[PDB]
């Protein structure tokens, strides 16, 4: 909670918020990211699988707010029928598409259009590792729209047995609420790390400052491994920036 108390963090974010209003080039930059300088090499290769950081005090977003695309295993008839009919998940998804239907229909410039129209991409964990070839480089470069893996039903797979296929609407809605409200991060084999913490014009300065503390606690807490506690050896420094604005320091060791 020290990072909240220090006035520099408040001063930086106020400067950043004033800037995005003034400079035209930053008119389209809406997200606030924190750049954390891990002391040592984390040593985790970038697997392109987002890891969710629980933000307890506040919720970043609600699933209703964003365009959500669901990529399922073939056939999508079962999942599409189950999700669409159930009231809770009836309107939850902007579109539901199977992997092969995704590969066939969208290619080239269509892939770029898909990127603009959808704000969140979620896929069954089975088909996630196939997505990098299908979605393309634009989705998997920069981590803004990197897909989030989800599980359709609470059933588990066992050796030498066949997993029973089911779609559980209430379970599915539970994850997407977790995904949208909580922030996420992707490990990489270098000091740096970027985690979204707030959205400009929606989150007040205390909220962003509180969210930053949540990110620091979960990420340094060894008890939360393997999802958390990946920054071993302390943090040299933290910055705050938008997509195009520069790095403003908020904590230095």
């Amino acid at each position: 909670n020290d990072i909240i108390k220090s006035g520099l963090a408040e001063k930086a974010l106020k400067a950043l918020i004033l800037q995005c209003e003034e400079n035209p080039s930053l008119k389209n930059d809406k997200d606030i990211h924190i750049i954390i300088n891990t002391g040592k090499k984390m040593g985790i290769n970038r697997d392109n699988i987002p890891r969710i950081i629980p933000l307890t005090k506040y919720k970043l977003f609600k699933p209703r707010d964003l365009n959500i695309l669901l990529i399922t295993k073939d056939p999508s008839a079962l999942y599409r029928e189950t999700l669409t009919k159930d009231e809770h998940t009836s309107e939850l998804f902007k579109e539901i598409i199977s992997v092969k239907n995704l590969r066939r229909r969208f290619k080239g410039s269509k892939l770029t259009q898909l990127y603009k129209d959808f704000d969140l991409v979620v896929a069954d964990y089975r088909v996630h590792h196939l997505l990098p070839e299908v979605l393309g480089s634009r989705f998997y470069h920069g981590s803004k729209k990197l897909p989030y893996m989800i599980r359709m039903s609470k059933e588990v797979k066992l050796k030498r047995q066949q997993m029973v296929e089911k779609c559980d609407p209430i379970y599915v809605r539970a994850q997407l609420r977790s995904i949208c409200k909580n922030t996420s991060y992707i490990p990489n084999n270098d000091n740096c790390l970027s985690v979204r913490v707030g959205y400009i014009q929606k989150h007040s300065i205390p909220e962003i400052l509180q969210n930053i503390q949540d990110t620091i606690n979960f990420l340094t807490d060894k008890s939360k491994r393997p999802q958390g506690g990946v920054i071993k050896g302390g943090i040299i420094s933290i910055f705050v920036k938008t997509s195009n604005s520069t790095s403003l320091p908020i904590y230095q060791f």
Binding site: D47, I52, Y125, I170, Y171, Q227
Partner: peptide
């Protein structure tokens, strides 16, 4: 929860909480 085919399930799974399950 772990799936032997996809080790990527275990890390970066969405945590599910009581508030999430409850309807709006």
């Amino acid at each position: 929860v772990k799936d032997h085919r996809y080790p990527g399930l275990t890390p970066g799974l969405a945590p599910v909480g009581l508030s999430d399950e409850e309807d709006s």
